[PDB]
């Protein structure tokens, strides 16, 4: 009377992830254990995440890092999708820090190097696991970090920003709580910074029951450094938890940091953008729309500020695509951004833009 999938007999539920239930699987013959994520096809289509999952599987099946949970196999059934993964007996890093207190400088550094190694591997693979927290860092028998819920993760694509506000308010970057556009790695760096504080202190840097003050505190980048903290790691944290993404640490800057480097194992590791106008956003969009048509160009209005435009080459008889986007700079100025859409392509893009600019504002 055992529920089996693969040759693993499904047992106890380890938890409930982003998109599914996670159950233990112990092999019929060998006793080998796996973590099985159950994704009901009807639910993964109700939330329109079918595409999300397709990509998520694609990435994770080819990934292989010692501090990222291995995705062994994906078993499809008419009903649901079974994601067979590597199981780790130690559970959450979060409960570790609950049960035992904060980790010692040495122990903290080890685990931080391990996590960051994994975080880096993801980024090196144009994957950004947003929602990076002790709750999603699992531990194995031998105390090794294992990055786990890629449900909120996204792809990093050349020339494009992400928008989705994702993780736990505490671990979430200020721009994520601010709901501003972001590149991707900087928000994983911030979350990893929160993880470092959690390891060294055993508490959260930014935390309050009063949600408004929690968000002020996060956006003010102010956290308490207890006297027992080594000034060098305080240096690293001050760098990692920069409210300005442009001023924030990078996996490179961290890798170069003295605190990090220590005992680190071998196995791990006058140009102007677009055109700017001070007019009303709706007047700007109207102007650019009556300019695109004035060039006999095909287009498709996505957002009231995003437009995907096409042009037929009068010579080579080829289709060339680009996307236009209005961003706000000052409280009084806005700028239209031109981005090339990949199927001379580059020169044709310049030409396409140039035409539009001569018939436009600053």
């Amino acid at each position: 009377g055992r529920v089996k999938i693969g040759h693993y007999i499904l047992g106890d539920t380890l938890g409930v992830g982003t998109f599914g239930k996670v159950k233990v699987g112990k092999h019929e013959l060998t006793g080998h254990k796996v973590a099985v994520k159950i994704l009901n096809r009807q639910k993964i289509r109700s939330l329109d995440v079918v595409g999300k999952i397709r990509r998520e599987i694609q990435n994770l099946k080819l990934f292989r890092h010692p501090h990222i949970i291995k995705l062994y196999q994906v078993i499809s059934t008419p009903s649901d999708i079974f994601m067979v993964m590597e199981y780790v007996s130690g559970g959450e890093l979060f409960d570790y820090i609950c049960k035992n207190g904060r980790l010692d400088e040495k122990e903290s550094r080890r685990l931080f190097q391990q996590i960051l190694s994994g975080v880096d591997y993801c980024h090196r693979h144009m994957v950004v696991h947003r929602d990076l927290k002790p709750e999603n860092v699992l531990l194995d028998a031998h105390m090794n970090a294992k990055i786990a819920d890629f449900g909120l993760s996204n792809m990093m694509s050349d020339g494009e920003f992400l928008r989705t506000s994702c993780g736990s308010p505490n671990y979430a970057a200020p721009e994520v709580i601010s709901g501003r556009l972001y590149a991707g790695p900087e928000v994983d760096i911030w979350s990893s910074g929160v993880i470092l504080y959690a390891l060294l202190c055993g508490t959260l840097p930014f935390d309050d029951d009063h949600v408004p003050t929690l968000f002020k505190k996060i956006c003010d980048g102010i956290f308490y450094t207890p006297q027992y903290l080594n000034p060098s790691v305080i240096s690293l944290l001050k760098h990692m938890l920069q409210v300005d993404p442009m001023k924030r640490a990078t996996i490179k800057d961290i890798r170069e940091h003295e605190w990090f480097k220590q005992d680190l194992p071998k196995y791990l590791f006058k140009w102007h953008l677009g055109i700017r106008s001070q007019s009303r956003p709706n007047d700007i969009m109207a102007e650019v729309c009556r300019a695109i048509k004035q060039l006999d160009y095909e287009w498709k209005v996505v957002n009231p500020y995003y437009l995907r435009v096409r042009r037929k080459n009068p010579v080579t008889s080829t289709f060339s695509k680009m996307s236009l986007q209005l961003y706000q700079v000052d409280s009084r100025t806005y700028l239209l951004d031109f981005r090339s859409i990949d199927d001379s392509h580059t020169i044709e893009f310049f030409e396409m833009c140039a035409n539009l600019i001569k018939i436009l504002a600053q």
Partner: protein, 159 residues
């Protein structure tokens, strides 16, 4: 391998089906969900449930009523349901944003080769940048990646 799940309470729940000559197969309960996974040959199968003394079907699931008035559930175990990417493919059937600071980080402004340049953040690739129009000649520029290398091309164009 097909999943047979009964959502709803019960002390004892069984699965009778064409695939097992209508024999009562016990379904294990975790909580509120009674399940059994079993591989069935690709094709049509009819099943019913024996939920605490009552023979029922999952009404949420497709049925079939017999010439004799028998109402059983039906299942079409398709080839497509077995392969993940095939199954996922068959499944898929205001104010302006603030300017990200990233787009203001160029590689042309920031002894050495004038040809050589720093590596860019993926985020600023394919974006159009331009110099102020001096002498009635426009200068446009952009960084594009070709494989594992990058090229910042700048066009000198009259207007």
């Amino acid at each position: 391998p097909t999943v047979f799940r009964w959502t709803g309470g019960g002390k004892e729940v069984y699965l009778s089906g064409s695939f097992n000559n209508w024999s009562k197969l016990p379904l294990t309960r975790s909580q509120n969900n009674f399940v059994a996974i079993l591989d069935l040959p690709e094709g049509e199968h009819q099943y019913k449930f024996f939920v605490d003394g009552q023979w029922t079907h999952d009404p949420s699931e497709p049925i079939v009523t017999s010439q004799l008035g028998t109402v059983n559930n039906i299942i079409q175990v398709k080839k497509t349901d077995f392969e993940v990417f095939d199954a996922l493919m068959v499944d898929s059937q205001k104010a302006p944003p603030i300017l990200p600071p990233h787009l203001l980080q160029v590689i042309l402004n920031k002894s050495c080769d004038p040809a050589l340049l720093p590596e860019p953040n993926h985020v600023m690739l394919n974006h159009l940048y331009a110099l102020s129009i001096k002498d009635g000649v426009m200068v446009l520029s952009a960084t594009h990646r070709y494989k594992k290398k990058y090229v910042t091309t700048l066009l000198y164009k009259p207007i």
